[PDB]
Write a protein that binds this ligand. Sequence first.
Ligand SMILES: *[C@@H]1O[C@H](CO)[C@@H](O)[C@H](O)[C@H]1NC(C)=O
Ligand SMILES: *[C@@H]1O[C@H](CO)[C@@H](O)[C@H](O)[C@H]1NC(C)=O
Ligand SMILES: *[C@@H]1O[C@H](CO)[C@@H](O)[C@H](O)[C@H]1NC(C)=O
Ligand SMILES: *[C@@H]1O[C@H](CO)[C@@H](O)[C@H](O)[C@H]1NC(C)=O
Ligand SMILES: [Ca+2]
Length: 544
Amino acid sequence: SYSPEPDQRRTLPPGWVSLGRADPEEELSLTFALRQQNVERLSELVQAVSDPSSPQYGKYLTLENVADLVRPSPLTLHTVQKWLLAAGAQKCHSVITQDFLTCWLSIRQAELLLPGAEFHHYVGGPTETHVVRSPHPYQLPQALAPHVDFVGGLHRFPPTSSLRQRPEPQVTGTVGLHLGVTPSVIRKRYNLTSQDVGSGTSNNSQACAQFLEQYFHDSDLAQFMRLFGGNFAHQASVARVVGQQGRGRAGIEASLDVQYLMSAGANISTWVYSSPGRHEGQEPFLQWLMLLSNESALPHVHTVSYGDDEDSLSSAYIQRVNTELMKAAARGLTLLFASGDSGAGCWSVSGRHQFRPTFPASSPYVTTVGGTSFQEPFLITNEIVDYISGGGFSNVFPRPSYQEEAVTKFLSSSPHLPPSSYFNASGRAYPDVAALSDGYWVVSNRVPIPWVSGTSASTPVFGGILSLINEHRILSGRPPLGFLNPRLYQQHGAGLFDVTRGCHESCLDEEVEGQGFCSGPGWDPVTGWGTPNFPALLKTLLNP
Ligand SMILES: *[C@@H]1O[C@H](CO)[C@@H](O)[C@H](O)[C@H]1NC(C)=O
Ligand SMILES: *[C@@H]1O[C@H](CO)[C@@H](O)[C@H](O)[C@H]1NC(C)=O
Ligand SMILES: *[C@@H]1O[C@H](CO)[C@@H](O)[C@H](O)[C@H]1NC(C)=O
Ligand SMILES: *[C@@H]1O[C@H](CO)[C@@H](O)[C@H](O)[C@H]1NC(C)=O
Ligand SMILES: [Ca+2]
């Protein structure tokens, strides 16, 4: 047998507790990632459909097209099906691309199927998220090496919300003319007029996902929109909620994404993806990702807050997830990911420090969004770096060709380069773009909450503005932008406000002294090309 994921971290993350051994007779649901075909061909098709210089630009695959391409061989399907049925799998589901298969097993059956697996219950975080995972590595038969990439639900823990304290209520002697960031502030700064809203006359649509154990509240959105939405046409309900069953407590992150996607992309049909509630063998992100490939008609724009440390992931998992992002890019979906909230990050390895990139932010196949702030508090002038803004260089994926010029220019030109030991100059660099990330208002459980901060905020803002641009494209009879990066870099970030002041954070240590990369003229790995000036950016994304 062999371990498919020797290099997946299995360590118990902070704020989690091991509760007990799972009962042999408990049932759990494990997702099996099956061996795809024609993946190299898929990468060629993506290169073509996303390159604005190609005759094939915008000619995206249907989900049917993708499935016909990448779906596993008959041998793979038959070998895995026989293998699972034998072990006692039940109530399995697949997806249209046929490259995921999820099945219920008993804990006993599962630990026979996957020798080494030892399932325990864990709880984590302020809302007591529950999972069942193995601290021990697992093995597959050699006969499955050709057929199975990995088994979801074994190791990787879902995200839990920070216990970091926001600023307390307080007096000042300047209570401001206006505290913090609201929809009005966003739309003013990025030059959306009141006319800059969806018309509902196409079937343009957009989507956000996050993966903390929090529930979406339509009531909070309604209140948010009454508070903040007075001066632009808006919708006060989502078009669809995917993944949420039952009633439960709202949270800041689950409020932020929707409330501000629907402010930046106003009067556009919006989905929410939101799977709180018990599914202990599911990984939340993998579930979401798998399910993209199970629905043919999707929103064009998806704004996603999710990250691990890149180094924590198995090769098997990270490479497969990257292929799933490729599949989405082949279909003309624009997937945006928050760049992270720890700057360049900090990783202690081999007695030393280096930067710590995150994934999927590091995927060459997503638009990754960093964070800016204003210089003075009250006042919506020029943008600078928000110190938390995630960025840096992959240790896994090589610099994609579409950022060769931009990155080489930065590396050759930047007067503030960190020590070379701290980063991988060869790697995919991010972010690609940026928006405000400091001091948002949300409504959660019917309470307005200020000082909400992070690239989780910037990300739905940037996405909404893209979704409004798509509305223009679609009404004029053109395909949506889809995978944006090739075009954006080819166009040297035209239409974006170039962020040139400030650096993001890193190790508080004797060498880099709390700073990672610095922003500069043009593309940098703190803010990318920078922030959306709508009317200017719109002009650059109309033809082709
Ligand atoms: C995919 O979609 C079909 C509904 O069309 C459903 O029956 C199936 O269970 C879905 N797959 C998964 C893994 O959820
Ligand atoms: C907003 O969209 C709705 C359809 O959902 C449409 O009736 C309305 O005209 C739109 N408002 C504007 C200002 O385009
Ligand atoms: C540096 O990045 C490249 C990808 O461009 C990768 O192949 C290599 O493993 C990385 N180095 C380390 C030490 O991870
Ligand atoms: C919004 O437009 C004004 C010009 O009226 C410009 O000063 C500002 O930079 C624009 N916003 C962005 C983000 O470029
Ligand atoms: Ca810059």
